[PDB]
Ligand SMILES: [Ca+2]
């Protein structure tokens with residue numbers, strides 16, 4: 001039971017669940033551990049990715065399913081990093097790396113993630129990720145030079 | 151007095167000082183509010199900028215004054231954001247934009263800053279910034 005956990009640990013578990021969900025992702029189970037109005041933010045705004053609802057994130061996942069296979073998604077905290085928890089603000093900050101096998105190659109970058117939970121600290125209300133814009137523009141470019149469906 | 155403030159507010163003020171120091175930066179006063187062993191980290195590692203001591207930061211500040219004039223440095227939090235403070239870990243996280251005027255170009259980008267203070271919450275022990283790598287590489291190539 002999450003509510004038996006100390007608030008600090010509860011926030012970390014609930015924030016961490018985002019990466020476990022992505023690691024075990026199945027279209028038949030969808031995005032779990034989120035509030036109905038949870039929003040995903042992609043920083044910086046200069047990258048041009050608009051804020052997205054649970055449903056819009058689902059549509060992105062469904063869309064890329066048809067264009068590229070995704071396998072072996074892996075998320076880990078950068079070694080030596082510790083979760084930054086602001087209990088009063090229901091916020092958790094991780095320093096993260098994400099790995100995945102996309103089509104014929106490796107996706108792998110480094111991120112800042114900022115989670116915000118509901119008042120109870122049991123569901124994610126907002127996910128924000130600051131992204132490696134040079135890497136992501138390059139990935140997007142190679143993606144555009146690729147035949148849809150491989 | 152800083153030790154008169156509650157820790158949360160003292161951590162924010164110590165973290166915030168970094169940007170006020172940058173805004174009024176003067177070679178003859180240098181980098182204030184930092185422990186002597188303070189380290190500036192520039193994320194992501196893929197950007198290829200190595201960690202720097204107080205003195206290596208001053209060196210870079212000095213080396214840039216000869217190539218281009220910098221004026222009207224302004225730092226502000228992204229509206230709607232709040233400082234994220236982890237009292238136990240002496241950590242503060244800001245969502246920031248930074249503005250400056252160079253050899254007639256505007257510099258302006260959005261960042262995450264992560265500050266770590268000393269145990270008293272009076273001085274900066276570490277500053278980490280996650281930068282906009284597409285834009286910072288452009289900028290660095292333009293020079
Ligand atoms: Ca990478």
Ligand SMILES: [Ca+2]
Nearest residue numbers: 046258259285
């Ligand atoms: Ca910019």
